[PDB]
Amino acid sequence: AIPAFHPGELNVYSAPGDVADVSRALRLTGRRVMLVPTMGALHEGHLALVRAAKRVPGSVVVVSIFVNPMQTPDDDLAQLRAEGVEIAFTPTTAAMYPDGLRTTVQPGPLAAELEGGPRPTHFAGVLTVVLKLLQIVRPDRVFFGEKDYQQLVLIRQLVADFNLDVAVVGVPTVREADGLAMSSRNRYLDPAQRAAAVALSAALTAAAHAATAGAQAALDAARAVLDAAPGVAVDYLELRDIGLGPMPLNGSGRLLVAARLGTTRLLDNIAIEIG
Amino acid sequence: IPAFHPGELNVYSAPGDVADVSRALRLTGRRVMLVPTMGALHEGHLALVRAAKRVPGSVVVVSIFVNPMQFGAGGDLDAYPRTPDDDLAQLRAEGVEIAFTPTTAAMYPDGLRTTVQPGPLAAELEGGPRPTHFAGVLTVVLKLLQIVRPDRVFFGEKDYQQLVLIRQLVADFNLDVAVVGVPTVREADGLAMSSRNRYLDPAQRAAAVALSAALTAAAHAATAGAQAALDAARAVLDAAPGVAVDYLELRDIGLGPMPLNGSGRLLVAARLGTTRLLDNIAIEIGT
Ligand SMILES: Cc1nn(C)c2sc(C(=O)O)cc12
Numbered sequence: 001a002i003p004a005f006h007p008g009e010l011n012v013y014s015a016p017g018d019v020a021d022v023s024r025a026l027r028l029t030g031r032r033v034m035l036v037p038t039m040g041a042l043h044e045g046h047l048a049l050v051r052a053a054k055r056v057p058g059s060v061v062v063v064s065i066f067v068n069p070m071q072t073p074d075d076d077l078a079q080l081r082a083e084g085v086e087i088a089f090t091p092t093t094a095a096m097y098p099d100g101l102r103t104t105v106q107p108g109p110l111a112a113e114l115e116g117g118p119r120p121t122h123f124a125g126v127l128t129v130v131l132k133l134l135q136i137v138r139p140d141r142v143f144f145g146e147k148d149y150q151q152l153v154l155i156r157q158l159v160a161d162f163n164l165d166v167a168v169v170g171v172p173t174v175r176e177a178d179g180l181a182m183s184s185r186n187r188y189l190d191p192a193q194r195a196a197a198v199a200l201s202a203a204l205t206a207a208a209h210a211a212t213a214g215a216q217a218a219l220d221a222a223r224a225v226l227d228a229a230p231g232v233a234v235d236y237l238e239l240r241d242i243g244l245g246p247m248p249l250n251g252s253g254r255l256l257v258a259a260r261l262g263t264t265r266l267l268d269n270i271a272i273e274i275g
Numbered sequence: 276i277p278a279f280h281p282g283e284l285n286v287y288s289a290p291g292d293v294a295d296v297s298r299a300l301r302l303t304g305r306r307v308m309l310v311p312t313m314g315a316l317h318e319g320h321l322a323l324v325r326a327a328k329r330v331p332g333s334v335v336v337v338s339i340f341v342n343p344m345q346f347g348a349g350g351d352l353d354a355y356p357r358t359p360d361d362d363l364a365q366l367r368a369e370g371v372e373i374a375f376t377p378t379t380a381a382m383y384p385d386g387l388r389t390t391v392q393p394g395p396l397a398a399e400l401e402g403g404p405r406p407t408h409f410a411g412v413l414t415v416v417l418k419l420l421q422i423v424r425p426d427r428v429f430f431g432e433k434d435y436q437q438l439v440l441i442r443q444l445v446a447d448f449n450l451d452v453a454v455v456g457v458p459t460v461r462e463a464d465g466l467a468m469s470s471r472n473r474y475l476d477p478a479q480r481a482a483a484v485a486l487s488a489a490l491t492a493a494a495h496a497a498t499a500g501a502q503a504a505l506d507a508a509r510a511v512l513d514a515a516p517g518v519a520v521d522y523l524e525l526r527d528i529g530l531g532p533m534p535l536n537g538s539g540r541l542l543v544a545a546r547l548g549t550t551r552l553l554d555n556i557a558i559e560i561g562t
Pocket residue numbers: 037038044045046048049144145146147171172173174175181182183
């Protein structure tokens with residue numbers, strides 16, 4: 001028997017088999033199943049993922065809330081109900097890992113770069129759980145923010161390399177009024193830190209406009225903006241091609257930055273068109 | 276989609292071709308059965324095919340791919356037997372409707388990039404000296420499952436450790452396929468079917484009955500306990516000219532981090548000249 005599913009309401013499932021059976025039943029009814037993976041503590045950046053999913057005609061939206069051990073609940077659910085989301089998938093760690101940590105996904109060597117410097121197993125955790133959610137839910141499209149750009153690229157590698165049939169959709173970063181990318185970590189910044197933190201996005205938009213004068217100009221403009229900020233310890237500032245290989249001499253790229261303010265690590269990135 | 280002719284063998288090399296045919300067949304009600312192979316087909320493989328065929332309304336996909344990722348060496352990949360003409364002929368005789376024969380480039384356009392890391396079972400038994408072998412196997416099997424999206428996938432008990440690892444892949448990644456293990460098909464004297472038996476000369480083929488003889492002796496000895504079962508098998512292997520044993524191990528049925536209770540699996544690997552042969556059997560201890 002298919003688990004209970006009430007159309008137009010928020011249906012919450014905590015068992016992977018339940019959400020798997022309801023998703024498969026809905027697919028058979030002529031719905032397109034959209035998956036929005038999250039770790040809860042939802043903010044407007046997560047809601048942009050939800051809204052992008054909802055606009056696909058025929059969509060049913062599944063939002064998973066799972067804190068990976070390997071990479072309020074009531075508040076989150078209320079936010080999803082207010083968005084018209086019909087399915088939330090809220091499994092326990094033991095439901096996700098009933099045999100513990102066993103077969104995992106090994107990322108390619110991109111996972112050791114950039115964010116993988118301080119956290120060399122983070123992406124193996126992310127890709128393992130993303131793979132599992134994709135198999136449980138079997139969505140037609142899966143939605144991820146561009147803010148975690150290296151994650152997004154590695155996800156696309158997973159999908160290509162394991163021949164997954166899902167479409168991966170990147171959704172542009174949602175930003176505070178001064179450009180700071182949204183994050184639950186922003187609230188930990190004191191006022192001097194929060195003022196300094198706008199240097200990340202300001203550096204990146206300066207670089208994207210400087211880029212008519214070429215790659216070096218784009219990088220030097222971003223470095224000058226970051227150098228104008230106090231208490232911003234830059235971990236990296238890298239211009240790469242769109243798939244995070246070496247930047248080509250012109251054309252399309254991506255500029256990524258990460259920095260520590262006090263004990264809080266912030267990331268941002270932007271599209272760059274060289275010349 | 277490309278062309279699909281029922282009651283005929285349709286051969287697709289392009290992953291996208293077999294994926295589109297598979298999805299179209301599933302959409303019309305047929306259940307899709309996958310039998311992954313490395314070619315060089317013998318009656319062991321045909322038993323998997325026959326098991327697949329008997330599932331009602333099934334369409335059978337047999338894949339043939341010598342997977343370079345599960346080979347290290349040392350020339351093992353180049354030496355693997357390739358008999359493509361006979362393979363497709365056998366499949367036509369068995370009434371299989373789909374053969375999937377992808378190229379290396381189609382499977383690995385980016386080389387080795389994201390891969391499957393098996394659990395600790397992969398570092399034991401066959402994996403002890405070949406620590407990357409089962410990562411190769413699981414990577415290729417995951418890709419085939421995603422390409423074909425079968426309802427059921429068929430593997431031999433012959434390669435028992437592989438089968439157990441594929442059940443772990445399926446469970447651990449929440450794959451929506453059922454894994455069917457098919458019992459080992461044997462020559463009249465007991466020798467397990469294998470695409471390596473072709474490398475046994477007459478003397479080695481005669482000597483090689485010792486593996487199956489040892490294992491069935493142990494299974495019967497096992498009414499007297501584990502030591503009795505192991506010592507019976509060791510005796511038979513010891514009496515065999517030119518069999519060099521690499522391991523003889525009695526484990527729990529899942530080969531995992533748990534001791535033997537009542538039900539076990541006894542596994543052997545041995546070398547006859549340069550030919551390495553495997554076999555295994557169910558063991559029931561005592562009562
Ligand atoms: C910032 C931000 N913008 N968006 C679309 C997203 S999705 C997300 C997330 O952590 O999933 C963060 C953000």
